Ligand binder design. Sequence first.
Ligand SMILES: *[C@@H]1O[C@H](CO)[C@@H](O)[C@H](O)[C@H]1NC(C)=O
Ligand SMILES: [Zn+2]
Lengths: 596, 196
Amino acid sequence: STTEDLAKTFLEKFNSEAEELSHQSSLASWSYNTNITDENVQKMNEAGARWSAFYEEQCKLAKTYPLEEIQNLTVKRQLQALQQSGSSVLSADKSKRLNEILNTMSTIYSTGKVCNPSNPQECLLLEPGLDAIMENSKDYNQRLWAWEGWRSEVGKQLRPLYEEYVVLKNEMARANNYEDYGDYWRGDYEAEGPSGYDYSRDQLIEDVERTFAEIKPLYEHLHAYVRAKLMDTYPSHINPTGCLPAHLLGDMWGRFWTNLYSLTVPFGQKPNIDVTDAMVDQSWDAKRIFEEAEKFFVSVGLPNMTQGFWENSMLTEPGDGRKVVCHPTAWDLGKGDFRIKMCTKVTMDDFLTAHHEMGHIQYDMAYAVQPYLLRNGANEGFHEAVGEIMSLSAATPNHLKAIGLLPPDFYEDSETEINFLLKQALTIVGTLPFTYMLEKWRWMVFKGEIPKEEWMKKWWEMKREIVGVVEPVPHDETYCDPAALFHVANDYSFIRYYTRTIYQFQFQEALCQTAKHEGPLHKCDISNSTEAGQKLLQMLSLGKSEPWTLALERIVGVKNMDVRPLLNYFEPLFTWLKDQNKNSFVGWSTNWSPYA
Amino acid sequence: NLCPFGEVFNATTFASVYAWNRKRISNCVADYSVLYNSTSFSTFKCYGVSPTKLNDLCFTNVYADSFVITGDEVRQIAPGQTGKIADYNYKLPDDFTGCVIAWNSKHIDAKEGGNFNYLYRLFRKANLKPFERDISTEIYQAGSKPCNGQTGLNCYYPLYRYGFYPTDGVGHQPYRVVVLSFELLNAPATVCGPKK
Ligand SMILES: *[C@@H]1O[C@H](CO)[C@@H](O)[C@H](O)[C@H]1NC(C)=O
Ligand SMILES: [Zn+2]
C-alpha cells in the first residue's frame, strides 16, 4: 500500500459514486430545462446540493494523498481536480461577504436601467432594450446616451464592490498558493506532463502577447477599412487617423463588429448564401436537419448518434404549454446518455448550429471511455473550438451542393467570398483585440500593476493603444467600465474566447490538409474524409487525461498556439483589404478624442 | 418430465451478481432448441460443447447461474477474463464447459427514478476462484491502518449499487445472464436431451 496504491483505490470509490450523483443531477437539470416548473426546479436544487456536499467531502479526502508521491500522471491529474477547492479556503466571514458581493454585482447588472434623456419616462433594461439600440441604431446621439448611461447608472454602482471583490479574490488565490486571482485563472492552462509538454501559467501571458502581435497587421487593416466606411454614416464624428468611438461599434461594448456588416459590406449588391428557402421548399423539418448532421459525422468515420439521442433529445420547441429553455445546449448526462436541447427552426442558422452542437456531442462520446474526472476538453478552449469547425465545413458551398441545398451549377462569386470573409472578420477578428485587452487589464489589476487610483485611466489607455477604440465621454475613477460587461460583473474568465479562436483554425487547417483540400482554406469541406476524422478522434478521445499541449499536437502536430492558420483563412481578405486602404491612413493615433 | 428452464429465464427478478443465484437441474428432459433457435438472446456462446449436439447428450447435473450486470460487463463472463465482475463477483474457469446466455433487460430492470436493487462488489483482497461466491459485507481495509468495522479514509464498504434508468446508453443498460454449466460424474445421468 503505497500512496499511489491507496489513491488509485480512493478514486475507484469516487468514480462509482460521483457517476451516480452527477447522473441524477444531470437528469434533474434536464427535467427542469425541458419543463420549467417549481416542482422540477425543486428536484434540481436538491439534486445539485447532494452532489456539491459529496464533492466537498471527497475534495478534502483527496488532499490525504500528497501529490508528490504520485508518479502515474493519470492518477495525479485526477487527484489534481479534487484538491482544487476554491473559495472554501476563506473564513466564514470573508467567504460569506464575497458571495454577497458577487450576488450584488450580478443583480445590479440584470436590473440595470437607463432612460432616454429626450423622454425620461422611456426607460430600458440592457438585454431587451439597450442592446436593441446598440445593435441597430445609426444615430450617433442615441447610441451615445445608451452607451454612456449604461456605465453611469450601472457601472458606477459596481465600482466599490469590484474593489472589494478584487481584494477577497486575491486572498482566496493566495490561500490556495497562487500569486493572485489572475494567476489562479491561468492555472487552467497549466500542464504537468512528459518531457517537453509542460506549460506554466506565465507561459500563457507570453503566448497570448506573441500571437496577438502577429494579428495586429490584419486587425489594423480591418480597423482602417471599417473606419473609412463609418465616415459615410457619421461624417461629423470620425477622424480618419484616430480611434473609433466606442459607442459606434455594433453592440454595447464593441466586443464584436458583427452588426457593422450592413455599413461595411464590400459588395452590397451580392446577397449572402442563405439556403433557408431551399430547406423550406424541400419540406425539411428539424428531424431532417440533425439527420444531415449525423450523416456529416459518419462521412468522416465518426460514430452514429445513439438510439437514445433520438428518443430523448428536445429538437423542437414543445409548444404544448410546457415552458422550456430555448438556448441550444449539448448535454452529457453520463452513463452513455447524450442529448441535444434546442428549439430548432428550419433555417440555415439552426442547420449550422445543429452541426456545431452535435460536434459537442461527438467530443463527449469520444472521451466517455476515460475516468469520470478527465471527461472534459483538453483545456477550456477545446470544446467550443471543436464545435466551431463543424459549421465551417457545413457552410461551404462545396458541402451545400453535396447535400442538395444549392444547385449543382452554383457559381462561386469572388465578390461573395470577400463579402463572406469580411463578415467573418468583423466577428472573429474584431473580438480578438477586445478579448485580449479586457483580460490584460484584469490580469494587471489582480497583480497590482494598476493601482485603483488609475483603474479607469489605464482601461482607456489600453483601449486606445491595443483596440484602437476611444471613449466618447471622459471617464474618471467613479466609473468601473469593465464591470459593465456581463463576464466581468459575473466573475468569469475571458481569455478562453481568445485561445479558442486560435485553436479553432489550427484544427481546421490540419484536417483540411489531411483531407487533401486544394484551394484557399476558407473553402474547405472535410466531408467524406475518414482520413481527417481519425486525426480528430485522436484528440477527442483524450479528454483532459493528457496535457493540452500533447492533445493539441495529436491533431495539428505542434505543442502550442499558432495564429498562422487563422491568418491564411483571412488571407484573401487581407490582400483585398491592403488594396482598399492604399489611399488612406492605416493605424491610429491615440491622442484625438471625440470630446477633445 | 420437462426441465424447468422457464423458471430461470422467465423469472420475474434476478439476483445481484455478487450473490449470483444457482439452480440445480436434475431428473428431467431439456430441449435446448427452445434456447439456441430462439431470437431473444444477444449472446449465446458455448465453450465445452457444441450447442446443436446438446440434444443428443446426457449429464448428471446441469447448473443454471443467473444474475444482472451492465452490457459493457457481459464481456467478462468468459474464460480467462478479468475486471471488477470476473475478479470479485462471478468467475468462469479456463476449462469452462457450458454456455453463456445474455439479453438486454432494460424493459424489466430499468425504472423511471432509477433501479438500485442490483448490487456488485467493488473491492476485495484477492480475486475469486472459479465459481466461488462471496456475500460478506466486511469493511475493505485498503491500508495498513485497521478499520474495526468503521468506514473512513482507507476503509471502504465493498458493495455498491447499479443504477439503471430507461434513458441510459446501451453499454450501461442492465443485462440478464444465465450461465449453464454441465458435468458428467460417476453417477446416473438424469438430465438428457429429448429422446427420439
Ligand atoms: C419464456 O416465455 C416466452 C413467452 O412468454 C417463451 O417464448 C419462452 O420460450 C420462455 N422461455 C423459456 C426458457 O421457456
Ligand atoms: Zn457550442
